Amino acid sequence: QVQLVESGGGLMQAGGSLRLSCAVSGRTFSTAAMGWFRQAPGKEREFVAAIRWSGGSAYYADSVKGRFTISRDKAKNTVYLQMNSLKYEDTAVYYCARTENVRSLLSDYATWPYDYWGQGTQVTVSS
Amino acid sequence: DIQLTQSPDSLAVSLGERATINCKSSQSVLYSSINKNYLAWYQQKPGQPPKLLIYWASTRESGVPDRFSGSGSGTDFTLTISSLQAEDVAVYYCQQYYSTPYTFGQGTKVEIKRTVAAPSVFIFPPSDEQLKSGTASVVCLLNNFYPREAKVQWKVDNALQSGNSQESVTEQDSKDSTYSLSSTLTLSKADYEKHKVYACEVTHQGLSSPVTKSFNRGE
Amino acid sequence: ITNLCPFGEVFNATRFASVYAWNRKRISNCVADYSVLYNSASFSTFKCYGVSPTKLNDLCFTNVYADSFVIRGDEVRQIAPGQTGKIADYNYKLPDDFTGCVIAWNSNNLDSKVGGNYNYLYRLFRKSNLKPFERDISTEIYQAGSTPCNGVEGFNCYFPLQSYGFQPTNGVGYQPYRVVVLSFELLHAPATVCGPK
Amino acid sequence: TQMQLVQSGTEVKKPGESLKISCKGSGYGFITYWIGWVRQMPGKGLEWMGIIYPGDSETRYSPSFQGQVTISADKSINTAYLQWSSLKASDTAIYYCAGGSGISTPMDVWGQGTTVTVASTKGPSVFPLAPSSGGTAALGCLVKDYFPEPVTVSWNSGALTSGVHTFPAVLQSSGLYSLSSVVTVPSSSLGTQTYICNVNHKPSNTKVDKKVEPKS
Ligand SMILES: *[C@@H]1O[C@H](CO)[C@@H](O)[C@H](O)[C@H]1NC(C)=O
């Protein structure tokens, strides 16, 4: 089965940097895009960044444009999220998601459902 | 689209000899990608569905004797009947299928040529039941003759009649390759009783001189 | 002592190809019985152009090609000579010269999944039409307007191909149809492909 | 047998009536066949009307028939149709359906054809052609004024085969058919044998058995 594993969460004071990884195992050549989502307690899941596996062009939620950079390494099948200039706004559980639905419009990956999810890692900003 | 013309229209060949039917199109029907002519040859006998004999100009369909052979390419094609046989008396059409619409040729009639045979002639006076019908029909029968061409001149009181005659020919009998003709002259009952001698004069290639067989009314 | 051309691999392959990257299989030095093709009752379309499959169990061709791919039902019309649309022009183009057969059948029991089978893809854009029997697997970002996109998607700049959404409850034609296309080669070359009868 | 086509029965219609004849394919592999319709008018050659692929109901007509008739197909029952909106007397002919597995391919399977006659039927009257007064003798039956073809004719319930000629029907100025049927027999038979001629015509459902003698 396809399983995604998140890595790199933890505690870090605001203004700092953090790089999360999400390793994928299984059905690899079918990867259409990967995306990162986050969820603070009591508030609803929100999209932050998606990247197309082919080509690698990225789509970003407005809230992290210029601060977060989504990245991917096809060879070892890991997607990355580089989180610089962290704010207490950013404290949440960060989920990576994988879809095999190839959508011509890149912004589709901000609204369309993702088929497989990790179980998340916690990022806590300390201000 | 392409139109086809075959020749001759009719053709008479004696048993065992070769019969040739040409067929020309207005456009070449030659796929150069496969190098095959998209032309077919069909046979049709009276009262029977058409039968596909040869497709792709030179390829025989199952159930077709090897006596049949067609060939040629480009614009002119020919279907050859090697050693003609009695069961081959039919009409033969050439059909294209390079492009739609498909079209046939006008058809060629093959018949067996035999040596000249004189017709045996009979004349039949009209019924007596049909003369209460108000019209009379006199009949002349030309039986077992070849070739088909034969002139049947009606005479009513020695006045040559024309324009009320109607002929019909059984086509070739399979055993002796002979036809039989029946001309039917039809008249009013009034006109029929104004004349007394009705004569059927047939002249044919097999007769030394025209044979007349007549009957006088009411005898 | 068997030596027949392997049509079992072409028609009975467990997974097929997307139409944009259609799979072509060649046929060479063998004898193939075509009666297995037309006489199995699982074909919804068997249009043969310029050749009858019941009448080439005799003639030897230079070689036979079997192109196979997967489209949706309403697009099987486009797999024909002289057609237009996203499939005929941007995915799999047949020449007007075509001599062969396009065989297709409903495959909603194989290429569907409950949540959709997005593994089959089709091309939406390219700057020019496909030449006959061309396979373009390019993934260059289609430039739709004056704006040139140097490999990054954005405004008037889209990914050239999208994927079908094959879920089993879709009406017919939004359902996957597998297609196999047989093209024939023969004139001035050694012939090694024919049939028995 | 790979494929055989079976057509609608013979239809005797009147002008203006609708009409839809059938052609049904029995066999495996019908999905490959392209059914076409050929028309043959009485005593003339064959004319190609149109063709149809039942899988898509893609149909092409020929220029001399587009719009004048329509070519349907019911894929679920391997049947191709041919239909007139309103029949004209110009439509009296035989209609063959023909099949070939592909387009621009030979038509290698043919149906029996459906005769369709579009005019009012009329019963035949049959009169005797009596022999005249050694060697050979001729006699026969004259079937006059009937529509449409065909009309039966046999001698002695079919027991008399050779020496009999049944001429092709001709169309009179009345618009009605009529034919003659003669036989040649040894003149010795005229006092012995009884030569019945049997004449059915099922559009009018007549069946007449007249026997001919020498009259005096
Ligand atoms: C594919 O398999 C079926 C049975 O599962 C068989 O009947 C058929 O002939 C096979 N197809 C080919 C092209 O051999």
How was this entry determined?
X-ray
* Residue C172 CB–ligand 1 contact under 6 Å: no
The CATH number fitting domain D4-117, selected from 3.20.20.140, 3.30.930.10, 3.40.50.620, 2.60.40.10: 2.60.40.10
On whether both C96 and C5 belong to a single domain, the answer is yes
* Cα gap C54→C49, rounded to integer Å: 13
Nearest CA to ligand 1 atom 10: C8
Question: Which residues are bridge partners to B200 per DSSP?
Answer: B154, B213
- Identify whether residues C25 and C86 lie together within a single domain: yes
Rounded to whole angstroms, the Cα distance separating A43 from A60 reads 20
Shared domain check, C104 and C24: yes
- The beta-carbon neighbor of A100 closest among C118, C154, C162 is C118
Q: Determine, for residues C53 and D108 on separate chains, whether the beta-carbon distance falls below 8 Å.
A: no
Q: Residue C133: CB partners within 8 Å, gap ≥ 6?
A: C67, C93, C94, C95, C183
**CA D197/CA D199 separation, integer angstroms:** 7
Please indicate, yes or no, whether residues C108 and C121 belong to a single structural domain of this protein.
Answer: no
Residue B33 contacts C where some CB pair is shorter than 8 Å: yes
Contacts of C163 in chain A (CB under 8 A): 32, 100-103
Same domain, C19 and C59: yes
Whether residue C160 sits in one domain with residue C108: no
Q: In whole angstroms, give the CA distance from residue B165 to residue A30.
A: 87
Residue among C38, C44, C52 minimizing CB distance to D100: C52
Q: Do C175 and C161 have their domain in common?
A: no
Nearest to C184 among B34, B38, B55 (CB): B34
C62 and C85 share a domain?
Answer: yes
A29 touches chain C (CB under 8 A): no
* Nearest atom (ligand 1) to Cα of C10: 13
The Å distance, Cα C37 to ligand 1 centre, comes to 9
Interchain contact C125–D (C-beta under 8 A)? no
Nearest CA to ligand 1 atom 14: C8
Contacts of D107 in chain B (CB under 8 A): 40, 52, 95
Which long-range contacts link D209-214 to residues 24+ away (Cβ below 8 Å)?
A: D210/D126, D210/D127, D210/D128, D210/D141, D211/D128, D212/D128, D212/D129, D212/D130, D212/D131, D212/D139, D212/D140, D212/D141, D213/D128, D213/D130, D214/D130, D214/D131, D214/D132, D214/D133, D214/D190
Q: Is the CB of C139 under 6 A from ligand 1?
A: no
Q: Which of C5, C12, C110 to mutate to test the pocket of ligand 1 (most atoms within 8 A of CB)?
A: C12
Resolution in Å equals 2.7
B/e letters for A6-42, b = 16+ CB within 10 Å, e = fewer, are beebeebeeeeebebbbbbeeeeebbbbbbbbbeeee
For A106, phi and psi rounded to 5 degrees? -65, -35
Contact between C118 and C163 under an 8 Å Cβ cutoff? The reply is yes
> How many Å lie between the centroid of ligand 1 and the Cα of residue C4?
14
Q: In what order do the strands lie in the sheet with B51-55?
A: B10-13, B108-112, B90-96, B39-44, B51-55, B59-60
The two three-digit tokens of residue D157, written as one number: 């319930």
Q: Which chains touch B (3 or more CB pairs under 8 A)?
A: C, D
Three-state secondary structure string covering chain B? CCCEEEECCEEEECCCCCEEEEEEECCCCEECCCCEECEEEEEECCCCCCEEEEECCCEECCCCCCCEEEEEECCEEEEEECCCCHHHCEEEEEEECCCCCCCECCCEEEEECCCCECCEEEEECCCCCCCCCCEEEEEEEEEEEECCCCEEEEEECCEEECCCCCEEEECCCCCCCCEEEEEEEEEEHHHHCCCCEEEEEEECCCCCCCEEEEEECCC
Residue nearest (by alpha carbon) to ligand 1 atom 2: C12
Q: Are residues C18 and C93 in the same domain?
A: yes
Q: Would you say C72 and C138 are in contact if contact means Cβ atoms under 8 Å apart?
A: no
Q: Is C8 in the pocket of ligand 1 (CB under 6 A)?
A: yes
Q: Which of D3, D35, D101 to mutate to test the interface with C (most CBs of C within 10 A)?
A: D101
Which chain B residue's Cα is nearest to C189? B34
Do C136 and C172 lie in one domain? The reply is: no
* Residue pair D118/D97 in contact by the 8 Å Cβ criterion: no
Give, as one character, the DSSP assignment of residue C190. Answer: -
Residues 6+ apart with CB under 8 A from A41: none
Whole-number Å distance, alpha carbon C60 to ligand 1 midpoint, is 23
The domain containing residue C131 runs over which residues? 116-167
Give the Cα separation of A111 and D34 in Å (integer): 48
| Partner chains of A (3+ C-beta pairs under 8 Å) | C
* C105 interfacial to chain D (CB closer than 8 Å): no
Domain locations in chain D as residue ranges? 4-117, 125-211
Per CB-CB distance under 8 Å, the chain B contacts of D128 are 127
- Tokens coding A68: 């977060």
The count of structural domains within chain C is 2
- Note whether D4-117 and D125-211 share their fold: yes
Q: D175: part of which helix (H) or strand (E)?
A: none
Measured distance CA(C164)–CA(C120) in Å, rounded: 6
**CA of C37, closest atom in ligand 1:** 13
Residues in chain A closer than 8 A to C139 (CB atoms): 54-55
The CATH architecture assigned to D125-211 reads Sandwich (2.60)
Contact C162/A52, CB-based, under 8 Å? Answer: no
Domains and CATH numbers, chain B: 4-112 (2.60.40.10), 120-216 (2.60.40.10)
Residues C14 and C58 in one domain: yes
Distance CA B73, CA B25 (A): 11
Q: Does B31 touch chain C (CB under 8 A)?
A: yes
Of C153, C155, C166, which to mutate for an interface test with A (greatest number of A Cβ within 10 Å)? C153
Q: Which residues of B178-193 are buried (b: 16+ CB within 10 A; e: fewer)?
A: bbbbbbbbbbeeeebe
Of the candidates B83, B44, B76, B41, the one whose C-alpha atom is nearest the C-alpha of residue B59 is B41
Q: Which of A30, A55, A101 sits opposite C151 (nearest CB)?
A: A55
Chains that contact C by 3+ CB pairs under 8 Å? A, B, D
Q: Separation of C67 CA from ligand 1 center, angstroms? A: 17
C-beta C11 within 6 A of ligand 1: yes
- Strands D93-100, D114-118: pairing is antiparallel
State the pairing for strand pair B76-81/B68-73.
antiparallel
The beta-strand segments (E) located in chain A are 3-7, 10-12, 18-25, 33-39, 46-52, 58-60, 68-73, 78-83, 92-99, 116-117, 121-125
Clarify whether residues C175 and C100 are in a common domain.
yes
Residues of D in contact with B133 (CB under 8 A): 125
Length of chain D: 216
Contact C186 B34 (CB under 8 A): yes
Backbone angles phi, psi at C102, to 5 degrees: -110, 110
